[PDB]
Amino acid sequence: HMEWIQSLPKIELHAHLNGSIRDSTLLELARVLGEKGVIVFADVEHVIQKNDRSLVEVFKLFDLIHKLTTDHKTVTRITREVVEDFALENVVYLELRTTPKRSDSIGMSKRSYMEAVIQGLRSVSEVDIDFVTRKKIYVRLLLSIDRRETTESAMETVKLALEMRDVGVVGIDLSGNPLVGEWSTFLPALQYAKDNDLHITLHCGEVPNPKEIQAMLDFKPHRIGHACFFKDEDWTKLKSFRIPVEICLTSNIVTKSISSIDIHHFADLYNAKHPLILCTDDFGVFSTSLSNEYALAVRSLGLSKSETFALARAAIDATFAEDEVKQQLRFIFDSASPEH
Ligand SMILES: O=c1[nH]cnc2c1ncn2[C@@H]1O[C@H](COP(=O)(O)O)[C@@H](O)[C@H]1O
Ligand SMILES: [Zn+2]
């Protein structure tokens, strides 16, 4: 069964760039930076292997990753590697999200960080890529606002995303530590993005926060991530607004946001015929792949091949891609439909 899942064409809508790095690359970068003295390799490798990746604790790990990866040449490298890995497991469409970074000591701006991501996409050679406007993969980009940021800084990210629509930026994400920051800080920037026809996805309900969950739903983003701590009134509103949910099974269970796959809300959403999309979140941090996520879901719901194929194909109308791309995806899935 895992073989048929691996060959299934798949759509990834929730994958953070610096959460998707290969272990071998992360440790290579750790070794190099150690031998330069920027850090102590044994300690860094130890936080890499020891971190329990509970929620509070995952964000410590990201602060460490960012010390290893915030340089233009590294951004380019990991962008290429992430696209390759997804393409190799037959992801045919990827929305990759990343937080653009500022770092004055190396002359890195949010814009130059993103230019390094584009360079990564241009450097992809193992597979064919469409990112502007042999496996082939369509890639489009989401710029993330981190909940640590100010309204002004969030607006800088939205302005950059509008400038980069010609190289495949299609939307904005709100992510980062859900215990930090206030919705009122980010709402004005997200509203500007939405009024400029960017699509919006929000990390929503990663921790209990009833007023924030309601405010995010009332904003009517185009998708939401996770929804782990929704209450009944939140589900009612979500189902009537028809906002698709990006479901991250391994991430949710590992962080203990959801106590087990047998109670995970994706089963309720599936049976309610509410749109959901299986995603990896951070396949490096959480040691998974999109195929493995599909395998967990197929086992837990007991889906047949055709039900699984139908679920995978349903994600097309949740993408933020232009209509021409969705028609190509419909052709890719229609072409694969009888083998499933
Ligand atoms: O579980 C999650 N919840 C909220 N934010 C996350 C999660 N996983 C990754 N991220 C965000 O994604 C970033 C890592 O990818 P980056 O944006 O490419 O730097 C982190 O610094 C977080 O802000
Ligand atoms: Zn996420």
Swiss-Prot record:
The UniProt note on the cofactor reads as follows: Binds 1 zinc ion per subunit.
Locate the residues binding Zn(2+). Answer: H14, H16, H203, D281
The record's GO molecular-function terms, alphabetically, read: deaminase activity; metal ion binding; N6-methyl-AMP deaminase activity
Q: Which Gene3D superfamilies match?
A: Metal-dependent hydrolases
Q: What is its main location?
A: cytoplasm
Extract one GO BP annotation from the record.
nucleotide metabolic process
What family is reported? Belongs to the metallo-dependent hydrolases superfamily. Adenosine and AMP deaminases family.
Q: Where is this site: Important for catalytic activity?
A: H226
Q: What happens when the gene is disrupted?
A: Slight reduction of root growth. 10-fold increase of the ratio N(6)-methyl-AMP/AMP in leaf cells.
Q: What is this protein called?
A: N6-mAMP deaminase
Question: Outcome of mutating D281 to A/N, per the record?
Answer: Abolishes catalytic activity
The organism is Arabidopsis thaliana
Active-site residues (renumbered)? E206
Query: Mutating N18A leads to what result?
Result: Reduces catalytic efficiency 2-fold
